[PDB]
Amino acid sequence: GFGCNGPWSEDDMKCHNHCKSIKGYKGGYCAKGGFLCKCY
Amino acid sequence: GFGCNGPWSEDDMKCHNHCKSIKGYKGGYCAKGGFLCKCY
Amino acid sequence: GFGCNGPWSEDDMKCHNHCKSIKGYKGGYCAKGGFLCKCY
Amino acid sequence: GFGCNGPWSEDDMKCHNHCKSIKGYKGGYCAKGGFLCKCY
Amino acid sequence: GFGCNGPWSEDDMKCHNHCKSIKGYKGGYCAKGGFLCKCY
Amino acid sequence: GFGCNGPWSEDDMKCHNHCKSIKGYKGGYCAKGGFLCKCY
Amino acid sequence: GFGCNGPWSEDDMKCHNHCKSIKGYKGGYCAKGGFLCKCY
Amino acid sequence: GFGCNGPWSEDDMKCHNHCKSIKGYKGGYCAKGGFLCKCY
Amino acid sequence: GFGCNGPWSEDDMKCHNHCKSIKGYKGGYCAKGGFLCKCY
Amino acid sequence: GFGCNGPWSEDDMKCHNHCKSIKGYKGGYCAKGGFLCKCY
Amino acid sequence: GFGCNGPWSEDDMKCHNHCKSIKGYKGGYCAKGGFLCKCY
Amino acid sequence: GFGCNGPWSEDDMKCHNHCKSIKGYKGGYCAKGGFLCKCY
Amino acid sequence: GFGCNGPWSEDDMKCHNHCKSIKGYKGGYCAKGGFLCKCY
Amino acid sequence: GFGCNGPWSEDDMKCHNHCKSIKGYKGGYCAKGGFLCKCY
Amino acid sequence: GFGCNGPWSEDDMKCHNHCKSIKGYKGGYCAKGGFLCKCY
Amino acid sequence: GFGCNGPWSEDDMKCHNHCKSIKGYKGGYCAKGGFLCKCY
Amino acid sequence: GFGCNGPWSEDDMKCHNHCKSIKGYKGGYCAKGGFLCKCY
Amino acid sequence: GFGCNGPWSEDDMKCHNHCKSIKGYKGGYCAKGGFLCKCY
Amino acid sequence: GFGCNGPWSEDDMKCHNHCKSIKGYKGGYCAKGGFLCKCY
Amino acid sequence: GFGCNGPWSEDDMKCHNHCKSIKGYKGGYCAKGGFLCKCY
Amino acid sequence: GFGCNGPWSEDDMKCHNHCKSIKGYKGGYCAKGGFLCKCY
Amino acid sequence: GFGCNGPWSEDDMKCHNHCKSIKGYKGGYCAKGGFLCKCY
Amino acid sequence: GFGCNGPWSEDDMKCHNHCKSIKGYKGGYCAKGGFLCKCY
Amino acid sequence: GFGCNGPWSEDDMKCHNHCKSIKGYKGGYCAKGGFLCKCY
Amino acid sequence: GFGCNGPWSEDDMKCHNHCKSIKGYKGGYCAKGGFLCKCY
């Protein structure tokens, strides 16, 4: 979810913004080859 | 199922929430290129 | 069949349940881009 | 034909059964986005 | 024409048979979402 | 809208032209698997 | 409803406008393969 | 547009031919997971 | 084109065979993540 | 081809089995990042 | 985001240009194996 | 095969378990940069 | 496995923690150039 | 960019040619493990 | 882990900083040829 | 280029053969840790 | 760190320049066989 | 080539066996720090 | 070979054990600066 | 072995401790220019 | 730096030429066991 | 050990300091041609 | 340079041959403990 | 230490200068056959 | 050359045998402190 949907993803930052909603995380990215919102 | 339906999927967390319904799993994602609810 | 009908599919588990009807298979999913009930 | 008629298709296996009528094919599915009986 | 008439189509192969009437084509299907006899 | 209507869409550029009607956008396309006019 | 009626839909924005009638939503589209007014 | 319509696309080269209509481009392809005519 | 259509591609060798139609090329494959017939 | 189709590939050994069909090759794999049947 | 989308990325410099938008950074690249816009 | 599918691989031990099925081998790993089940 | 997946690995300690599950081993690392969980 | 895209890179010399476009540089290569066009 | 990931490592000091988290250690480095966070 | 692409390189001699195309050079190799065709 | 990364290091002086940032040190080098920024 | 590929090399003796294919040479090894098949 | 692979070697005794497989030799070591299994 | 690995050796006493495991030997050192565990 | 990079160094004279850039020095060499450009 | 590592040794006094840790010894040095910490 | 590279040197006579290129010198050798081409 | 490192020593006077740092000593030299800084 | 390579030399008689290849010489040895094949 959060937009991590492979080639059909769109740069909506939903993964990034959602990850930003958690303390200790300054961003997120589509891991698992573009299919998981992984927060860091 | 559980919303893992490729480009026609919608961020309903149905995969994630369904995976959450099992002990030992803190989330889920659309593996198999967005076509399988894989729990982790 | 078994519900693997692209965007018009509904999460009826018919693919999954049908795949469950075979020994050695613990689930199924809509492969071929959501148009084939592939059992695993 | 053979039931591959998009959202108006019904799970009659007509595509699958028809494909089964040919040697070397163990099934069929509605390719072309649910509008062609493709045998495999 | 040739039977490609959406949900009111009937599996008369008229699209398929008509497409078969042309060299280089081994079949046909109701493209444009079930409303055009497309030959292949 | 704007023609993004899945397989029944027609190449009327209505999505593209409509997107062109907004500053900063040089085109548009049928995202959400062909069912949303997404402007870019 | 709201115009999400598959190939017989017309670009009346009824889905879009209806979705606009709810706070937090900047548009809507015909999900479920053109048969549900999904608001976003 | 230009035929980039996901699984319902047909190999009409409309994307490719349209891209060919621009200097500096020797072809085109359906990017965005088969839903955008991207010229190169 | 030539069958390079992501998950909805089918192993028709159309990319490969089409690439074979050019001197100096012994095959082809679906580059750009399965969305371009790249000849080699 | 031969199943080398990125994340949408399935472990059908089609690449491997196809490579096995050539003398001097004891297997094959999806090179080019999972998008080419490379025989060895 | 910013185009870092694995094999489906396109050389749009969106990662690079976006990274350029920050002082002290003269470029960017798709780290995490092509799935994160890392600025440098 | 056997799960050696680059970033889209999942830790199913299919490579490892498959390699275990051969005498003289105590494990396996995804060589060729994560795209070949190499047994050892 | 155990997370040793080259550039797509994530610092989940799965290799390390898994290695810790064996007596005589105080850690593990991704040998074979980041593609094997080697325990020490 | 410039083709430095890991395993999905193609030998288009785009990195090399782009680097050649700068005085004092006689070539370029995909540093950062194949993910950065580094000029030399 | 801790960033010791061969050529795909980035100078995040994660190895160094992590090693700093232990008494008696004034730094760390990527031993085992860049694939192990060794503390000193 | 010329096949010097780290772990995803294949023994195509493209580096070697390309280097052979220059007088005074009897071979080539993937320097820079497998990421540059260096001629000698 | 600081560029001391074995064969994948690049002559960026990051080790040297970083070492220069400390009083009493007129340079630095990649000790530990090219894997530690040692200041002198 | 011949397997001399740094940490991603595998003990396939391809360097050694290839060197054995030349008179006056009783073996070979991966010189240039594991990146050249040097025959002796 | 036989594990003599520079810094990426692991103490598998493969060089030593392999050397032990020859009469007159009571051990082996990684000569040529850790890149040749030399038997003694 | 036993840590005698040239410049990439680390002062783990593995050579020394291993040599200590034999009667008549009070230590060991990396002979052959740092590439052999010689016991004394 | 300046090419003094152990076994991965290449005879680019970068150490030598760089040392030549200073008055009183007629050459340079890779001291510290091939890991420091020492000028003389 | 203790830093007695031939040309790759660094003047860390580890040999000397370690030797100092024993009564009756006022220093140490790298005997065996720079490859053994000999205490005196 | 000229092959004087410690244990990783190879008997290429590059030091010797290079020294031969100067009048008054009948050979050369790797002085400075195998790390300088000294001509005589 | 202090530069007394056999053939790999360099005339840095580190032995001499270090010896000069002690009253009653007007110099130092590399005793023990070039492997000990002996002060006099 | 000819094996006169300091502590990393091996008793290959290459110096001796090479010296034997000249009339008036009954042997050779590694002069210059083990770094020159001197014939006598």
Swiss-Prot record, chains A, B, C, D, E, F, G, H, I, J, K, L, M, N, O, P, Q, R, S, T, U, V, W, X, Y:
Binding locations of beta-D-GlcNAc-(1->4)-Mur2Ac(oyl-L-Ala-gamma-D-Glu-L-Lys-D-Ala-D-Ala)-di-trans,octa-cis-undecaprenyl diphosphate: F2, G3, C4, D12, H18, Y29, A31, G33, C37, K38
Regions crossing the membrane: none
Region spans: Binds to membrane interface: 6-9, 31-37
Organism domain of life: Eukaryota
Location(s), subcellular: Secreted; Host cell membrane
Disulfide bridge partners, by residue number: C4-C30, C15-C37, C19-C39
Family that this chain belongs to: Belongs to the invertebrate defensin family. Type 2 subfamily.
More info: In mice infected by S.pneumoniae, it has an efficacy comparable to vancomycin in the peritoneal model and to penicillin in the pneumonia model.
Its biological purpose: Antimicrobial peptide that potently acts against several species of Gram-positive bacteria. It selectively inhibits peptidoglycan biosynthesis through complex formation with the cell wall precursor lipid II (1:1 molar ratio) thus inhibiting cell wall synthesis. It does not disrupt cell membranes. Is especially active against numerous clinical isolates of S.pneumoniae, including all 90 different serotypes and isolates resistant to clinically used antibiotics. In vitro, shows considerable selectivity for bacteria over mammalian cells.
Protein name: Fungal defensin plectasin
UniProt organism field: Pseudoplectania nigrella
Portion held of the full protein: 56 to 95 of 95
